[PDB]
């Protein structure tokens, strides 16, 4: 019969705390504060936020898209998630000042800092084989070699490749840490976003280390979220109020549907959500 | 549930691991019990986080600084201040085990010096000539403050995957992010790696002390450092220690005073500092691994 304290209490409870303590500001205008942690146990269970739906599709898709390098928008659209679309769209682009780059064209976003870190960026159609960092495949092999390394660290926020983004890193660096045969992984997330974003964030960041803990022969452990600017707009306050009224239901279950190698091997199909049941979706106007 | 303040968060945490965690070995041989991901919050607001739960070398935190400030990586140059904590760091012996035998005693590699004032650029020795190479982060910290403060952006590195090959000690603080709210300036440190017993108490002041730096240099007042750990570990040889320590009640902590009006961040001097009604418990020994 009865289940632990709720993971999800602990995002409710980050929400509640900037509702009463935050101070407000512009940027549609926000409650904000600065430094917070919460900690969500993977351990037979995934952190799917159920006091709203979460659209799971696109946390897969956008992941499958970073691993796979890929830093054209129109590459993650076409899977039918459309959230990175308006960043590489011709005015916005323009408007950064990047009026000779293609359509789609995002920069030197996740995809390339995670596989080509420190590259030379040129275009989102160039081939990067085998120039920069494969962060993500030396994070693999050194937890795969010594898993009491302390450096196990996979940095996006490269300070030269700025003004190449078509937008700046919501999330700056992620730290891998192994005892007892289970993979924890912290995000340092600089800004977040906490109607429209966070939910969302902590679902990916969650399924990397269900990944990485696949490949790597692994219990995955914790993921703890580590915030630096954390905000509410102010048109998601009231959505955020109710919200707030509805209870969690238990975390849903990931299943892995069959032995993956590779990182780069995992496919949309080899992932299960189960018992999944959420409350109602909430529109955030983004 | 209302939360643990000031010296009781680092009591705490330590007790938590004593208790929690869990043992490893380190890359040092000393045995380690560790945990991963902690954060605390210390207010700056009329108060500055020196532990008195035992006494912390004042002049060391303040002498450190003022050598990662002037972009040092010379271990030398601190050691001539008085300041010993990085000469072990820099010595032939703990240099020969890293395959840097070029490297003169002392040279550290690119470390905070290095990182703060010329993030970048391509390090060589701990003497080469480093003027208008590299990112100065930190005079662009204090100048988006002045200029832009909302601006969330505001973040120092010192962890540069490109430099890892050329490091003896890779950075335990892998980045500083600021924040300005109401003219209130906060720090958050993102320590990957931290020595519990030993660094800890120093990060802590340092880094208070660097946010009380570039509120003063911009105007503003200091609000929060915030410290989030990656990997927390208590060598075993420290346990002892520190069970003395946690026995011991917190006193106040102390004020720090600022003596003069200074311009530039460069041109602080350790005399411009005064550390008052500082009543700590005794030193307590522990070795350094
Ligand atoms: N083991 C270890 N090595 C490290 C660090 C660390 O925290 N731990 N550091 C992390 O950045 C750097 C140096 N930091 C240090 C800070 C203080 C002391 C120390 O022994 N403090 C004494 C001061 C006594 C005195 O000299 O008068 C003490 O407080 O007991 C050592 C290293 C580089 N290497
Ligand atoms: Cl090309
Ligand atoms: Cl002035």
Do not use: C, N, W
């Given at each position: 019969e009865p289940r632990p304290p709720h993971g999800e209490l602990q995002y409710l409870g980050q929400i509640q705390h900037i509702l009463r303590c935050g101070v407000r500001k512009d940027d549609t205008g926000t409650l904000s504060v600065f430094g917070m942690q919460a900690r969500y146990s993977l351990r037979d269970e995934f952190p799917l936020l159920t006091t709203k739906r979460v659209f799971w599709k696109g946390v897969?898709?956008?992941l499958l898209w970073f691993i796979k390098g890929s830093t054209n928008a129109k590459e993650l659209s076409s899977k039918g998630v459309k959230i990175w679309d308006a960043n590489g769209s011709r005015d916005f682009l323009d408007s950064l000042g990047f009026s000779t780059r293609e359509e789609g064209d995002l920069g030197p976003v996740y995809g390339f800092q995670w596989r080509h870190?420190?590259?030379?960026?040129?275009?989102?159609?160039?081939?990067?084989?085998?120039?920069?960092?494969?962060?993500?495949?030396?994070?693999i092999d050194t937890i795969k070699t010594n898993p009491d390394d302390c450096r196990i660290i996979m940095c996006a926020w490269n300070p030269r490749d700025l003004p190449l983004m078509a937008l700046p890193p919501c999330h700056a660096l992620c730290q891998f840490y192994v005892v007892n045969s289970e993979l924890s992984c912290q995000l340092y997330q600089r800004s977040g976003d906490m109607g429209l974003g966070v939910p969302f964030n902590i679902a990916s960041y969650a399924l990397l280390t269900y990944m990485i803990a696949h490949i790597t022969g692994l219990?995955?452990?914790?993921?703890?979220?580590?915030l630096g600017d954390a905000h509410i707009y102010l048109n998601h306050i009231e959505p955020?109020?109710?919200?707030?009224?509805?209870?969690?239901?238990?975390?849903?279950?990931?299943?892995?549907?069959?032995?993956?190698?590779?990182?780069?091997?995992?496919?949309?199909?080899?992932?299960?959500?189960?018992g999944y049941n959420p409350h109602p979706t909430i529109k955030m106007e983004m």
């Open positions: 897969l898709e956008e870190f420190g590259a030379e960026y040129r275009d989102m159609e160039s081939d990067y084989s085998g120039q920069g960092v494969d962060q993500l495949q030396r994070v219990k995955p452990g914790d993921f703890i979220h580590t955020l109020k109710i919200q707030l009224q509805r209870e969690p239901r238990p975390f849903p279950k990931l299943r892995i549907l069959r032995k993956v190698e590779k990182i780069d091997d995992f496919k949309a199909e080899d992932f299960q959500i189960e």
